[PDB]
Design a protein around this nucleic acid. Structure first.
Ligand SMILES: [Zn+2]
Lengths: 95, 93, 84, 107, 72, 34, 95, 80, 107, 93
DNA sequence: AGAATCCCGGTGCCGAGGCCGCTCAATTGGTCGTAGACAGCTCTAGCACCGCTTAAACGCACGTACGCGCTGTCCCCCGCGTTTTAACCGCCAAGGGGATTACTCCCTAGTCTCCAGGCACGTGTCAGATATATACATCCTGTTCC
DNA sequence: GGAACAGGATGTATATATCTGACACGTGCCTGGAGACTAGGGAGTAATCCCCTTGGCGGTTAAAACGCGGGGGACAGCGCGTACGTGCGTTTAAGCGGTGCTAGAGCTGTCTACGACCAATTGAGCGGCCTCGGCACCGGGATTCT
């Protein structure tokens, strides 16, 4: 049995050294289509379009998570919460 | 020489929205810079859009699309309605 | 021919958000991070999709393109490379 | 023929002709359509009227009868969509809205 | 005769030695006045990792020489 | 060989990162920084 | 004698209700010139130029201080320390 | 020399009070001096390069607000 | 009349003629001077050389012969100045630099 | 139709720097997008500078002030150096 | 002891790079209209100066309150195993519309003439910045009943 | 000792006087905006190829879901002592008002090299094919970390 934290650190190392996509293609595509259902109707998508969309979402979420990790350690914590999320977004300038 | 600005037009708009409301010169300069900035943003976006669609003309359609891209929400909605009414009234002459 | 699809944004699953946090260098995850992440992710996509479909309706097309995705991203300051 | 300005034709207070001149002479595009300056003048007029109306209410609220950059700053920053439009915009002599954190208050 | 050692954060340390002293002598002096044991020290001068058993005169280290210290 | 810029160690021609301080090679025109 | 914090809140109210310049203009102008010899020697500066400079400087610093206050209160403190300064700058992306 | 020290501790206190801050630490003052110095360095570098290209020797409010517009920190009220 | 390309004349591998055509048809200015495309092509060649050299060094530090997006991201994020030039950039399959806050590692 | 890119040119640069190093399609597209974006930023900056100085033509001086604006520090220094030597060679030829 | 990952060697496969065909657009050269490079002149605001006054910074002390461990707690994420589920890959078919070519038409750049709207200029006058006095809201400590 | 309150001191909105410099309004004009007409290309419109997207189905799992045990981290109360708010006296020099000189920004005449347009062309760059090697994936040790 491993102590909690070591598996997480190994996961962090592996996912930082790797570059593959982390969100399942079909669920992300269905999410994109669901969001598109509101603006227009019967929209069609290029496969590269949802691929680039997923790339953007991956990068933005990774940057936000890094920012919130910095906020959490600044608050003398190692666990993030939506208080950290909202602080990071507010100072970035989206809220 | 002459240095043009939107002073007369901004004053006319302010008088038409408020019959009894004066304005200072510094606030007027802020208004002129604001109008120039919005003109720059909208026209630059429209020119970019025309370039990307392999089009060599800016018309009401790309102006409308640039307005919708820039202005948020009901501001964009009201601005689009105002622009469409103005274009309709102008072409109906 | 295309039936509407509600209740799909739960497909951004907890293992996926955990993997994203692991890539971002996050050590420990609370309970509400998943709901928070899903919400902000939906907002990000919604804003992007609004810009992209505005481009598409301007182009008088019906297929949203990877080009238009990069178009909206560069509009947002989120410019993306390798896709045109 | 009698002279009739394009602003009068479109029922606009903004200079349609000057907007068209800045469009062509500002080399945004090598041809500019006839309906393009009218639409741009309309949206500029609407935006200016909106922010001036908000500042006018602010000026009336503080019993001052002349628009001041402080009123302009209050008008833009108290409006959500105008604030989003002008998030990166700095107003000279604008100051900041009165805002402190409630926890910042004494207990 | 003094020598100057540069660290990784730009902090410069002054040592008082003679050309006859060995490299391990310099490492022990660094440990003495800074707490950095010889096993943690990697010394560079004139593009050479100075071997512990050799002396300063072997590497032609003169007065006020520029030395680079790397910790691992 | 190329000499390092950060730790100045005599890296061989095949070393594209420094052996000890682990810095990447720079151009003859522009050298790496701290 | 007022308890500490009361006069601080009064200063907050006074300076938030007011819009005049908080930086001494002659020292600010001398600082700008000091920075200015580093690029071109014997430069002549417009009074309006240094005025716009100090306006933008004051606005940027007051926004930075607002973000620092948010950082500190997220760290459950009312006293800001420079760790909040570089945290806010890193979050904003200025460093 | 060292006229950044002319940016005074009461001035930093006033600016923080306008920012809505209650309690100020000691290192805040010269930390603020440093960040202000680097910000002014960037802005002045851009504005002076504008003046350089203008074949002029007088830096103008126009050039400085144009640098501000470039940096994403656009300023109103000074023309343009 | 034997034709020699402007890129060959300037000692540049970048297409001076194509850059000139893009400058004209890209309507940045009413007219484009002769030295501007040459200068622009030289600058583009320099930046391409820097990025490719850094990416190739990163790849050869991984014992590989093809430069890939991971290598490009490593080069860009490992050069501080190229990072400042490329702050707002997202690279497809870029990944992230390996870094962990020291507090998270035991001592 | 013919779709233009920088594939051949960037490949020549790669062969100049590292003879034995190959390039992939995705990285090649990233390279093309990078060259296009830098071209866009630099040339647009030159266009705006020429507009502000009331100059209707873009020259090497405008391009040089543009690169000095956009590229920081050492990049600007050596970019100006390489560009100036290229321009001198072209004018000598 | 047990799990994770690097080192080394085989196999495949597909796509990267080199080679052939084409075509179109970059070269060459001349012409010509003009953007600006340059010289000249003007005036204005920008630097430097002076002195005075007083607003504000410096410095000192002093209390005090809050930042920082320190501790204990407790509950809640994390690792692990089992179950299940839908993602993914490869295959199928339909057809929607993305993109392309040709025609034409009409819309805007361009030129000319005319003319009046906005800008530089000037001047009365009132919004308000400042001053004084005051009553009320805040704040704090000393005093009092439980 | 702890909660409640009165009163003194302080800060501040409120009630008026004032004098003032910017603000808004009248005016000359001239230059930029508007009316007429041309023409030639930009773009709308019709028809088509087929690229690619949508829909779907069958396995095969890698991965998601769920539940459990538990140790680790968030959180709260505590204490202290140290750093900072607050106030007061002092010292500095910032700012106001004026003067002066002039370097340099700005406007004007000129003429000239500098760059757009057009004709012919030919080679460079892009589209398509072929191959082989560089890397993905495979397995067995060996080292490293927990
Ligand atoms: Zn080294």
């Amino acid at each position: 049995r491993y102590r909690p934290g070591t598996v997480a650190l190994r996961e962090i190392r592996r996912y930082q050294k790797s570059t593959e996509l982390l969100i399942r293609k079909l669920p992300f595509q269905r999410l994109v289509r669901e969001i598109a259902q509101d603006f227009k109707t019967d929209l069609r998508f290029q496969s590269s379009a949802v691929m680039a969309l997923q790339e953007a979402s991956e990068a933005y979420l990774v940057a936000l998570f890094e920012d919130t990790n910095l906020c959490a350690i600044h608050a003398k914590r190692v666990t993030i919460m939506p208080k950290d999320i909202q602080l990071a977004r507010r100072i970035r300038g989206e809220r | 020489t002459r240095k043009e600005s939107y002073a007369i037009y901004v004053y006319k708009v302010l008088k038409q929205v408020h019959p009894d409301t004066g304005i200072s010169s510094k606030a007027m300069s802020i208004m002129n810079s604001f109008v120039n900035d919005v003109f720059e943003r909208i026209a630059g976006e429209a020119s970019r859009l025309a370039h990307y669609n392999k089009r060599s003309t800016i018309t009401s359609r790309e102006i409308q699309t640039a307005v919708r891209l820039l202005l948020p929400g009901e501001l964009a909605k009201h601005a689009v309605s105002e622009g469409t009414k103005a274009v309709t009234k102008y072409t109906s002459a | 021919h295309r039936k509407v699809l509600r209740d799909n944004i739960q497909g951004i699953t907890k293992p996926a958000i955990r993997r994203l946090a692991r890539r971002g260098g996050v050590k420990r995850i609370s309970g509400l991070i998943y709901e928070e992440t899903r919400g902000v992710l939906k907002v990000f996509l919604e804003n992007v999709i609004r810009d992209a479909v505005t481009y598409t309706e301007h182009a008088k097309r019906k297929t949203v393109t990877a080009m238009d995705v990069v178009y909206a991203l560069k509009r947002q300051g989120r410019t993306l490379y390798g896709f045109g | 023929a009698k002279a009739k300005t394009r602003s009068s034709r479109a029922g606009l207070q903004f200079p349609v002709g000057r907007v068209h001149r800045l469009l062509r002479k500002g080399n945004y595009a090598e041809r500019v359509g006839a309906g393009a300056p009218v639409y741009l003048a309309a949206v500029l007029e609407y935006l200016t009227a909106e922010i001036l109306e908000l500042a006018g209410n602010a000026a009336r609220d503080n019993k001052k009868t002349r628009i001041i950059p402080r009123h302009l700053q209050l008008a833009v920053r108290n409006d959500e969509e105008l604030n989003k439009l002008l998030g990166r915009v700095t107003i000279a002599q604008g100051g900041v809205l009165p805002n402190i954190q409630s926890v910042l208050l004494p207990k | 005769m003094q020598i100057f050692v540069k660290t990784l954060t730009g902090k410069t340390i002054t040592l008082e030695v003679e050309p006859s002293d060995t490299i391990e002598n310099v490492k022990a002096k660094i440990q003495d006045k800074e707490g950095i044991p010889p096993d943690q020290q990697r010394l560079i001068f004139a593009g050479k990792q100075l071997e512990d058993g050799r002396t300063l005169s072997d590497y032609n280290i003169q007065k006020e020489s520029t030395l680079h210290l790397v910790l691992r | 060989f190329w000499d390092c810029s950060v730790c100045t160690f005599r890296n061989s021609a095949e070393a594209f990162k420094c052996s000890i301080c682990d810095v990447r090679k720079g151009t003859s025109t522009r050298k790496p920084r701290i």
